[PDB]
Each structure stands twice: as structure tokens, then as C-alpha cells.
């Protein structure tokens, strides 16, 4: 009859542990019959129970027993073990999938809402808000301290801001706040709100103070226009700079994110982009986005950075295509495997969710471990081979930027680039705008050092001024703190500048003679007719 | 005025130039030539010298035989000869080519590869015979050695005004704008180190028959090589004919034995093929 | 033709991985507007106005929006132009 039992044990422990049984159908009288092929087990549940490489042995080890209970012996060959890498990574074997996920909650973008969708939206935040609930998420982030570290001689806020693993905690915290509101009885999953797109007015939901309440026929104030701070009994205010309106910079700024292979250069490229937003919309009250101490209580915060956690998602995904790692990081290490200190700390998160998945590496697979999707990856409308089309197409030039190593100043500022041509006599300089990006902070926030450049693309700024990278001149920021009035001395270097040549031929693609406007061909007078 | 702005070939280093690595290789391919049986081998390449003589054919009764020397194409065969060398242990794993050790400089000492007696490999830590400091006379008897006797002259020093035989007599030899006085002095000065290394032992550098089974012989004569080729050198600066003899001109007809045999003697194709000085 | 020529450079400059619609040679001078294109009058050419400053008029092709027919010089392919460029710089040569 022959059940038989199999079990793995490693050399070094020694483990045993029993990755279940199977049975054969057995009789004296018989068809004489063998399998041409091996029954498989799925046994990977075990393989990583034991954290056990699937590379170590992990050697196999079966018992076999009749119905009786009698053990024979001498039975069988276990020897084969196979490893089925996912449909979804693409390096090898299948093509491009798009591969499924448990995927709860989809995630849509803020312009594709309906009334309904808006109105329980506001709802159910409303219950989060009249509630205790939603500042006590928000004091994750904000102003009250409760990260002390490494004694601790001095305490911090929670929230990490120069290191790489900065989008994974913000990505888990906009997690936690979709979780409850969709606990509140929210029809659907906190919305992005895409500021890539160029807007004469703000964001329908955020914008207005009181909207109109159709169950009740009553207006009502709008509990996405201000969050409440009620330990320091202020509310969250908004002062928008027109810088906000309009500019289609954020276009190329993400184009330069999403060119991004390496993690890192990612993430500073990306968290500085994210930053800009903070910037413009909060700008001189003190109780607002801009400052990083209070700008969690605005609830615009999370229809911010899923926004941002979607942009990073989008990356992700383009890494796969890239066959590069998508759901890892062969960047920053040490960073990778220490849980995010409110979220891992067993007080005041009491959500299961977020605090069992508080390491970074934990944070990786939004779809499979938080359990949420966005319902397109493509930005600006474009398919994602379409996006790394254009992003080959845009390496495929000369181009010059400005470098800018960043660190934590005790507060937000705004630093803008200028473009200095020195006059041929006398000495002359520095005075025509090249752009604007954002430092983000707070009195007490953690300290931070970039350990690699931000970029800032000034080739085009360059072209109207017929500079090249050859061509005389320099490159001067002008450094704005939060306060209106505040202007600074020299914190950071002076903006480094850098040449990449094309693949422009300079680098990567060979010489390709290029398509331009070029209409009017001339020719060679004596090919004349 | 503006002036002018598929193997790779061999690099014969310097000996005190060597690096870890390639005193590695070449200790190690000496090792397996010298433990070689075959024709690649060093016993039978030595053999191609002197004294189990090949000339005119193996096959005679008397045999006056073979190396050159004491005539115009003395140079010529010789370099050949290093050639086959080289060419052995390149196929043997040397990495680098015949290292030389010029006496063009000034010397206190014989080069650590030569004069040591057992080497120790960095890499693997144990340690082994120094094929390089004395080479095996198989045919006379598996004991036989070659030893060697290191006459004082060998270190002389640059006086006040007097400068080392060694400088003066290579200098007066690149002197020379004639091939064959270049050649008379040229081997003569030669000679030199034949007769300090080799002292009275009879195995020995001293001694034409058993010379060429000490491996230092060929050290020696890669720098040789190179003296006659910075001579080469020096007459393509004084727009005088290199790669040519205008003098003994008949003798550079005369193949190079035992190269010229091809056969099973040697082969080796391209030692063969340019057995003509 | 002599434009011809310059484009040609340009884009043997390309080829050499130098700059070619830049220029680091001539500082002070690439931003000043062309003294009869920038004139309000009489040039009311917009294409030209707008782009009379010397920077703006480096690629001709976006800007002015024509090719030439080939870019090859003599018969000579870009890449064997370079080479023969190259082999010239390879002997002693003497100027006034």
C-alpha cells in the first residue's frame, strides 16, 4: 500500500521538518507500472520556514509504511529537488506579463472620480476624523517626537527623510491610513492625485472648504480641506505659491526619476521631486505642508505620497522590463532590514498590517503584502515599453546638468538655479533663471547626508542661451528658506555641473545620424536639373 | 613645425623587474620543461648546444657539433636558439618571456632566481626546488649537476675614474658600424660571463659542451640577444643597414642547425622555417 | 557651401565625441544677438528675430529647420574622413 512520508533536514542544525506525505495505490496482483515522470510537491512553505537556501543542502529525507503501521525499507529515490523561478520576473523564460497579485483596494487617480465615489470618500475620512483616529496616524510623521536613538541622548521624528528607505515608510503609511478609511466603510481606496498634470486650480476634493451633502441636503464643511492639530489646538492651513500653477517642469523632473537604474539615485531624485510638492502648496504658514513637523495633519499628506508611492510603483515596474531588480536592492543595505520605528514600535501602532511588515524589505511588494493595486502603471498615457522608449530616445543626446549634494538643514527651503555668463570684459556674472527644487525639514527631524549628487537637467535653459558644455560659464543657486523673508548664506556646495554625452553619441548608442525637423533639403548646384 | 603623430608578442622583462606572478609561471613551466621527456623538454633543447652532438647530421660517425661561435653568424644562431627556448616554456605556461639580466648595469649580486636554491610559492605556500639555479645532465648520469664558480670580477665597481670592463668593452662593441667587427668584439664580450659564472667546475657555463644545461645560460643570452638588438637599433639611427649584413654575407645563407632539420629532431615550425640567419 | 562646410565639421565633431552645437571656445560672445537680425527694424523676420543670438543658431536643422542633401565631403563617408584627418596628423608637417 505504501503511504510514505517526506522531510527535509539540513546538515547544519540538524532541522527535520516534515514537508507533508503522499500515497501510492498498491495491490499483490498488479499492472506492472512505473511514472516517466516525477510527482511534485510544492515543499517551498518549509524551504523558507527552515530559512533554508534553496542553493545549501537541504537534503531530503523520507519514511515509508504499509497500512498496517510496518515500515519497509530500502524504498525509494527522493534525489531530485527543482526550483521554479516566477512567471512575473522575465529575466529568462516568459515575456513580459503584468502578473497577478492578491490585489484588494485599486488605487485610481482623484480626476477619474465620480460624485459617489467622492462623497463616501469624504465620509468615511469624516468618521476618521471626528473620531480620535486620523491624528494619531498623523503623529507617526509629524511634530510629536517619539524616536529616541541611539541611547538615546535625544529624541527625533519617526518619520526617515535622508535615507533611501524613505518612500518604503511613507509608502506603509499612506497603507495604514488607506486601511482604516476603508475600515470607516469607504467605497474605495485613497485616490492619487497626479500634480504632473498641469491644473488652473487645485484638486476638487482638497480645494473647496464645504461641500454640498446630498443624504443630509446640507452643506457641510469638507474634512479634506484642513486636518486638525489639536495638541498645539491649531489647524493645518494652506498657502499655495503660483509656482504651483501651471509648470509642466514635473513632466521632465519624473522623466529624469524614471530614468533612474540604480535605487538610490532613484530615491534622491524622487524624494527631492517630492519635496517641490510639499514645498509649493504649504508655503509660509508654519502650520502647514511645507514644514515637516506639521505637514502629516494635512490630509492632502496621503493624496500626496500615494501619488509618489505610485510614481515609485511605476519604477518598479520599469525595472522589470529592465530585467533589473524591481522587488530588491542591491543599493544602501544596512538600511534595508531595520523596521520603521513608529510602525515597529508596539505603541501607538496597534495595526497588525503595518507593524508586521515595518522592515523595509517588507514593503517591497505593495500588491502582495499590502494588498492594494493602481489601476494604470502607464504615466502621461504611455505603455511601459512606450516610457523606456522615450527614455532611450532622451539618453539618446547631449546633456548637461547641475549636481547638488543635499543634507539636512534644521528646516524646508526652496533653493533655485541660476545661470552666470561672465562678459568678456570686464568680470562679469550670475543672473538668469535656470530652475527650482526643494529641501524638506523640521526643527527636530533626523539628521541627513546624501552620499551622491542630485540632478537637475539645464540643458534646454542652456540651448536658448546658445551655451554648450564647452562655452564659458557657472552655475549659483539662490537659497529661500520657508520664511518669505529668508533668504541664506552658502549651506550647501556649489552646484557641481556634468556632461553626458550622447549615446549624442558621447557614451552609450553608436553613431546614428539623427532625425530632425529638417525640411528643405539643400543640395549640390551641379545635381541641379 | 609639427611632428608625426594576431598574438601578442612575448615581453622579455628585466629578472628584477618580475612580479610575483610571473616569477610564478615561469618557475613552474621551467619546472614541467625540465620535468619533460619530450623534444620540448630541457634536456633536449640543452642538447641542441653542444655536447650530445647533432652536427652535421645526428647520423655521423664524427660529429663536430653544432652551436656557432667564433664566426659572423654566432648572433643569428643563437638568438634562434633562445627562441626554441622561449617558445617551450611559453607553451609550458610562462606568462612573460625569457627574462634577461643585463650586465649593462653595474652588478653586486647574481639575480634572486638564479642564485637561490629552493623558491617558495606565495600563492599555494609550499616550497619547492628552484628550477633556475642549477639544471640536470640526464645522459652522463641521473646525479650529474651543473655547478658553478662566481669569479670576483663579476661585481666590479666603477672606480673614480675607471669605469667596469663589462661597460667599456660593450661600448666599444656597439661602436662599431661594421657587422662583422660589431660581431668579433660583440661575442668576445660575450664570453665574459661564461667565464665568471662558470669559474673551473666542469659542469659549467665555463665549459661549451655543458653550458647550456644550466638554465642561466639562457638568461644570460636573452640579454645577449638584446644587445646585439640595441646595436640593430643604433644602426637604424646612424641610417646604416640593420636586418642586413653587408659583410660575411655568404655565411648568412647557411642554415641554422639542428633548426634546419625540421624532421623529428626539432619542429618547432617557425624555428624551422627561419633556419636561415 | 561654406555653411556646408561647418555643418560637416559639426558633425565631425560629433564623431570625435566634442561638442558641436556648443561651443566652449568663445565665451562672451554667444549670447549677444546679431546686431542686424535683432533689430526690430528692419528685420521682421520672426524665425530669424527670435533666434538671432548665436547660441540659438548652432544645430541648423531644428532651427532652421533644412538638410543637405549628403554630409559627406568629397565622396568621403564622415568615419573614413576621419580617417584620412587622422592619417595627415600621422606625418611631420610644417606650417607658416
Given at each position: 500500500?505504501?503511504?510514505?512520508?517526506?522531510?527535509?533536514?539540513?546538515?547544519?542544525?540538524?532541522?527535520?521538518?516534515?514537508?507533508?506525505?503522499?500515497?501510492?495505490?498498491?495491490?499483490?496482483?498488479?499492472?506492472?507500472?512505473?511514472?516517466?515522470?516525477?510527482?511534485?510537491?510544492?515543499?517551498?512553505?518549509?524551504?523558507?520556514?527552515?530559512?533554508?537556501?534553496?542553493?545549501?543542502?537541504?537534503?531530503?529525507?523520507?519514511?515509508?509504511?504499509?497500512?498496517?503501521?510496518?515500515?519497509?525499507?530500502?524504498?525509494?529515490?527522493?534525489?531530485?529537488?527543482?526550483y521554479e523561478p516566477g512567471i512575473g520576473n522575465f529575466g529568462e523564460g516568459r515575456r513580459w506579463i503584468s502578473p497577478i497579485t492578491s490585489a484588494s483596494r485599486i488605487r485610481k487617480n482623484l480626476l477619474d472620480f465620480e460624485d459617489?465615489?467622492?462623497?463616501?470618500?469624504?465620509?468615511?475620512?469624516?468618521?476618521?476624523?471626528?473620531?480620535?483616529?486620523?491624528?494619531?496616524?498623523?503623529?507617526?510623521?509629524?511634530?510629536?517626537?517619539?524616536?529616541?536613538?541611539?541611547?538615546?541622548?535625544?529624541?527625533?521624528?519617526?518619520?526617515?527623510?535622508?535615507?533611501?528607505?524613505?518612500?518604503?515608510?511613507?509608502?506603509?503609511?499612506?497603507?495604514?491610513?488607506?486601511?482604516?478609511?476603508?475600515?470607516?466603510?469607504?467605497?474605495?481606496?485613497?485616490?492619487?492625485?497626479?500634480?504632473?498634470?498641469?491644473?488652473?486650480?487645485?484638486?476638487?476634493?482638497?480645494?473647496?472648504?464645504?461641500?454640498?451633502?446630498?443624504?443630509?441636503?446640507?452643506?457641510?464643511?469638507?474634512?479634506?480641506?484642513?486636518?486638525?492639530?489639536?495638541?498645539?489646538?491649531?489647524?493645518?492651513?494652506?498657502?499655495?505659491?503660483?509656482?504651483?500653477?501651471?509648470?509642466?517642469?514635473?513632466?521632465?523632473?519624473?522623466?529624469?526619476?524614471?530614468?533612474?537604474?540604480?535605487?538610490?539615485?532613484?530615491?534622491?531624485?524622487?524624494?527631492?521631486?517630492?519635496?517641490?510638492?510639499?514645498?509649493?502648496?504649504?508655503?509660509?504658514?508654519?502650520?502647514?505642508?511645507?514644514?515637516?513637523?506639521?505637514?502629516?495633519?494635512?490630509?492632502?499628506?496621503?493624496?500626496?505620497?500615494?501619488?509618489?508611492?505610485?510614481?515609485?510603483?511605476?519604477?518598479?515596474?520599469?525595472?522589470?522590463?529592465?530585467?533589473?531588480?524591481?522587488?530588491?536592492?542591491?543599493?544602501?543595505?544596512?538600511?534595508?532590514?531595520?523596521?520603521?520605528?513608529?510602525?515597529?514600535?508596539?505603541?501607538?501602532?496597534?495595526?497588525?498590517?503595518?507593524?508586521?511588515?515595518?522592515?523595509?524589505?517588507?514593503?517591497?511588494?505593495?500588491?502582495?503584502?499590502?494588498?492594494?493595486?493602481?489601476?494604470?502603471?502607464?504615466?502621461?498615457?504611455?505603455?511601459?515599453?512606450?516610457?523606456?522608449?522615450?527614455?532611450?530616445?532622451?539618453?539618446?543626446?547631449?546633456?548637461?546638468?547641475?549636481?547638488?549634494?543635499?543634507?539636512?538643514?534644521?528646516?524646508?527651503?526652496?533653493?533655485?538655479?541660476?545661470?552666470?555668463?561672465?562678459?568678456?570684459?570686464?568680470?562679469?556674472?550670475?543672473?538668469?533663471?535656470?530652475?527650482?527644487?526643494?529641501?524638506?525639514?523640521?526643527?527636530?527631524?533626523?539628521?541627513?547626508?546624501?552620499?551622491?549628487?542630485?540632478?537637475?537637467?539645464?540643458?534646454?535653459?542652456?540651448?536658448?542661451?546658445?551655451?554648450?558644455?564647452?562655452?564659458?560659464?557657472?552655475?549659483?543657486?539662490?537659497?529661500?528658506?520657508?520664511?518669505?523673508?529668508?533668504?541664506?548664506?552658502?549651506?550647501?556646495?556649489?552646484?557641481?555641473?556634468?556632461?553626458?554625452?550622447?549615446?549624442?553619441?558621447?557614451?552609450?548608442?553608436?553613431?546614428?545620424?539623427?532625425?530632425?525637423?529638417?525640411?528643405?533639403?539643400?543640395?549640390?548646384?551641379?545635381?541641379?536639373? | 613645425?609639427?611632428?608625426?603623430?594576431?598574438?601578442?608578442?612575448?615581453?622579455?622583462?628585466?629578472?628584477?623587474?618580475?612580479?610575483?606572478?610571473?616569477?610564478?609561471?615561469?618557475?613552474?613551466?621551467?619546472?614541467?620543461?625540465?620535468?619533460?621527456?619530450?623534444?620540448?623538454?630541457?634536456?633536449?633543447?640543452?642538447?641542441?648546444?653542444?655536447?650530445?652532438?647533432?652536427?652535421?647530421?645526428?647520423?655521423?660517425?664524427?660529429?663536430?657539433?653544432?652551436?656557432?661561435?667564433?664566426?659572423?653568424?654566432?648572433?643569428?644562431?643563437?638568438?634562434?636558439?633562445?627562441?626554441?627556448?622561449?617558445?617551450?616554456?611559453?607553451?609550458?605556461?610562462?606568462?612573460?618571456?625569457?627574462?634577461?639580466?643585463?650586465?649593462?648595469?653595474?652588478?653586486?649580486?647574481?639575480?634572486?632566481?638564479?642564485?637561490?636554491?629552493?623558491?617558495?610559492?606565495?600563492?599555494?605556500?609550499?616550497?619547492?626546488?628552484?628550477?633556475?639555479?642549477?639544471?640536470?645532465?640526464?645522459?652522463?648520469?641521473?646525479?650529474?649537476?651543473?655547478?658553478?664558480?662566481?669569479?670576483?670580477?663579476?661585481?666590479?665597481?666603477?672606480?673614480?675614474?675607471?669605469?667596469?670592463?663589462?661597460?667599456?668593452?660593450?661600448?666599444?662593441?656597439?661602436?662599431?658600424?661594421?657587422?662583422?667587427?660589431?660581431?668579433?668584439?660583440?661575442?668576445?664580450?660575450?664570453?665574459?660571463?661564461?667565464?665568471?659564472?662558470?669559474?673551473?667546475?666542469?659542469?659549467?657555463?665555463?665549459?661549451?659542451?655543458?653550458?647550456?644545461?644550466?638554465?642561466?645560460?639562457?638568461?644570460?643570452?636573452?640579454?645577449?640577444?638584446?644587445?646585439?638588438?640595441?646595436?640593430?637599433?643604433?644602426?637604424?639611427?646612424?641610417?646604416?643597414?640593420?636586418?642586413?649584413?653587408?659583410?660575411?654575407?655568404?655565411?648568412?645563407?647557411?642554415?641554422?642547425?639542428?633548426?634546419?632539420?625540421?624532421?623529428?629532431?626539432?619542429?618547432?615550425?617557425?624555428?624551422?622555417?627561419?633556419?636561415?640567419? | 557651401?561654406?555653411?556646408?562646410?561647418?555643418?560637416?565639421?559639426?558633425?565631425?565633431?560629433?564623431?570625435?565625441?566634442?561638442?558641436?552645437?556648443?561651443?566652449?571656445?568663445?565665451?562672451?560672445?554667444?549670447?549677444?544677438?546679431?546686431?542686424?537680425?535683432?533689430?526690430?527694424?528692419?528685420?521682421?523676420?520672426?524665425?530669424?528675430?527670435?533666434?538671432?543670438?548665436?547660441?540659438?543658431?548652432?544645430?541648423?536643422?531644428?532651427?532652421?529647420?533644412?538638410?543637405?542633401?549628403?554630409?559627406?565631403?568629397?565622396?568621403?563617408?564622415?568615419?573614413?574622413?576621419?580617417?584620412?584627418?587622422?592619417?595627415?596628423?600621422?606625418?611631420?608637417?610644417?606650417?607658416?
Amino acid at each position: 500500500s505504501l503511504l510514505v512520508e517526506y522531510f527535509i533536514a539540513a546538515d547544519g542544525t540538524d532541522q527535520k521538518m516534515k514537508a507533508g506525505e503522499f500515497y501510492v495505490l498498491g495491490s499483490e496482483n498488479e499492472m506492472p507500472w512505473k511514472f516517466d515522470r516525477p510527482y511534485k510537491s510544492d515543499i517551498t512553505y518549509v524551504m523558507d520556514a527552515m530559512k533554508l537556501h534553496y542553493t545549501d543542502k537541504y537534503h531530503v529525507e523520507l519514511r515509508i509504511t504499509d497500512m498496517t503501521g510496518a515500515e519497509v525499507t530500502d524504498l525509494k529515490l527522493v534525489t531530485s529537488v527543482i526550483y521554479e523561478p516566477g512567471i512575473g520576473n522575465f529575466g529568462e523564460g516568459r515575456r513580459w506579463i503584468s502578473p497577478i497579485t492578491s490585489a484588494s483596494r485599486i488605487r485610481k487617480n482623484l480626476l477619474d472620480f465620480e460624485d459617489g465615489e467622492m462623497e463616501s470618500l469624504r465620509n468615511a475620512f469624516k468618521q476618521m476624523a471626528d473620531e480620535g483616529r486620523y491624528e494619531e496616524i498623523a503623529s507617526f510623521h509629524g511634530v510629536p517626537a517619539q524616536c529616541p536613538s541611539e541611547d538615546g541622548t535625544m529624541v527625533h521624528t519617526c518619520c526617515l527623510h535622508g535615507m533611501p528607505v524613505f518612500p518604503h515608510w511613507h509608502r506603509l503609511y499612506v497603507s495604514l491610513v488607506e486601511d482604516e478609511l476603508l475600515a470607516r466603510g469607504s467605497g474605495v481606496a485613497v485616490p492619487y492625485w497626479d500634480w504632473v498634470e498641469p491644473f488652473d486650480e487645485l484638486p476638487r476634493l482638497i480645494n473647496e472648504a464645504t461641500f454640498y451633502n446630498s443624504r443630509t441636503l446640507q452643506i457641510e464643511p469638507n474634512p479634506f480641506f484642513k486636518g486638525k492639530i489639536s495638541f498645539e489646538n491649531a489647524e493645518t492651513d494652506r498657502d499655495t505659491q503660483p509656482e504651483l500653477f501651471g509648470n509642466r517642469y514635473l513632466y521632465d523632473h519624473t522623466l529624469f526619476v524614471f530614468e533612474q537604474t540604480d535605487f538610490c539615485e532613484f530615491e534622491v531624485h524622487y524624494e527631492v521631486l517630492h519635496n517641490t510638492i510639499h514645498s509649493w502648496l504649504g508655503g509660509r504658514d508654519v502650520h502647514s505642508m511645507s514644514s515637516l513637523d506639521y505637514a502629516a495633519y494635512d490630509p492632502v499628506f496621503f493624496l500626496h505620497h500615494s501619488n509618489v508611492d505610485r510614481l515609485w510603483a511605476i519604477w518598479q515596474e520599469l525595472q522589470r522590463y529592465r530585467k533589473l531588480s524591481y522587488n530588491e536592492a542591491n543599493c544602501a543595505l544596512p538600511l534595508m532590514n531595520q523596521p520603521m520605528r513608529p510602525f515597529s514600535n508596539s505603541t501607538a501602532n496597534n495595526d497588525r498590517l503595518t507593524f508586521t511588515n515595518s522592515r523595509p524589505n517588507d514593503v517591497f511588494d505593495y500588491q502582495n503584502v499590502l494588498h492594494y493595486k493602481y489601476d494604470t502603471l502607464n504615466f502621461a498615457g504611455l505603455s511601459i515599453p512606450q516610457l523606456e522608449r522615450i527614455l532611450q530616445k532622451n539618453q539618446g543626446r547631449d546633456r548637461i546638468f547641475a549636481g547638488f549634494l543635499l543634507h539636512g538643514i534644521k528646516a524646508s527651503a526652496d533653493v533655485r538655479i541660476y545661470i552666470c555668463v561672465p562678459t568678456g570684459i570686464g568680470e562679469e556674472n550670475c543672473g538668469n533663471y535656470a530652475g527650482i527644487f526643494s529641501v524638506l525639514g523640521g526643527e527636530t527631524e533626523m539628521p541627513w547626508q546624501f552620499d551622491r549628487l542630485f540632478r537637475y537637467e539645464i540643458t534646454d535653459e542652456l540651448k536658448k542661451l546658445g551655451l554648450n558644455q564647452n562655452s564659458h560659464f557657472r552655475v549659483e543657486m539662490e537659497l529661500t528658506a520657508v520664511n518669505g523673508s529668508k533668504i541664506t548664506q552658502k549651506i550647501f556646495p556649489n552646484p557641481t555641473i556634468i556632461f553626458v554625452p550622447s549615446d549624442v553619441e558621447f557614451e552609450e548608442d553608436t553613431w546614428r545620424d539623427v532625425v530632425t525637423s529638417a525640411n528643405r533639403i539643400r543640395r549640390n548646384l551641379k545635381d541641379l536639373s | 613645425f609639427v611632428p608625426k603623430k594576431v598574438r601578442g608578442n612575448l615581453v622579455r622583462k628585466n629578472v628584477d623587474r618580475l612580479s610575483l606572478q610571473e616569477i610564478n609561471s615561469l618557475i613552474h613551466a621551467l619546472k614541467r620543461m625540465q620535468k619533460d621527456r619530450s623534444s620540448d623538454g630541457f634536456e633536449t633543447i640543452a642538447s641542441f648546444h653542444a655536447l650530445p652532438p647533432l652536427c652535421p647530421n645526428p647520423t655521423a660517425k664524427h660529429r663536430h657539433a653544432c652551436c656557432l661561435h667564433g664566426m659572423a653568424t654566432f648572433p643569428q644562431w643563437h638568438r634562434l636558439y633562445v627562441v626554441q627556448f622561449e617558445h617551450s616554456l611559453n607553451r609550458h605556461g610562462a606568462i612573460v618571456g625569457v627574462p634577461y639580466w643585463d650586465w649593462t648595469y653595474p652588478m653586486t649580486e647574481v639575480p634572486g632566481l638564479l642564485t637561490s636554491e629552493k623558491y617558495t610559492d606565495p600563492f599555494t605556500g609550499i616550497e619547492t626546488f628552484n628550477p633556475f639555479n642549477h639544471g640536470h645532465i640526464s645522459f652522463i648520469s641521473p646525479e650529474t649537476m651543473t655547478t658553478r664558480e662566481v669569479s670576483e670580477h663579476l661585481f666590479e665597481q666603477p672606480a673614480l675614474g675607471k669605469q667596469t670592463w663589462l661597460f667599456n668593452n660593450i661600448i666599444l662593441a656597439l661602436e662599431q658600424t661594421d657587422y662583422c667587427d660589431f660581431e668579433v668584439q660583440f661575442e668576445i664580450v660575450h664570453n665574459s660571463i661564461h667565464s665568471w659564472l662558470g669559474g673551473k667546475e666542469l659542469y659549467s657555463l665555463n665549459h661549451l659542451h655543458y653550458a647550456a644545461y644550466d638554465p642561466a645560460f639562457f638568461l644570460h643570452h636573452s640579454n645577449v640577444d638584446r644587445l646585439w638588438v640595441v646595436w640593430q637599433e643604433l644602426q637604424k639611427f646612424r641610417g646604416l643597414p640593420a636586418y642586413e649584413s653587408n659583410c660575411a654575407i655568404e655565411l648568412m645563407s647557411q642554415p641554422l642547425k639542428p633548426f634546419s632539420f625540421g624532421a623529428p629532431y626539432n619542429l618547432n615550425p617557425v624555428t624551422t622555417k627561419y633556419s636561415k640567419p | 557651401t561654406v555653411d556646408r562646410l561647418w555643418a560637416i565639421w559639426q558633425d565631425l565633431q560629433r564623431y570625435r565625441k566634442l561638442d558641436y552645437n556648443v561651443a566652449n571656445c568663445a565665451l562672451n560672445l554667444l549670447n549677444d544677438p546679431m546686431r542686424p537680425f535683432n533689430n526690430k527694424t528692419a528685420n521682421q523676420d520672426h524665425l530669424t528675430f527670435t533666434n538671432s543670438r548665436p547660441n540659438d543658431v548652432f544645430d541648423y536643422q531644428n532651427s532652421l529647420n533644412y538638410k543637405f542633401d549628403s554630409l559627406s565631403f568629397s565622396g568621403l563617408s564622415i568615419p573614413r574622413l576621419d580617417d584620412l584627418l587622422e592619417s595627415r596628423q600621422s606625418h611631420d608637417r610644417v606650417f607658416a
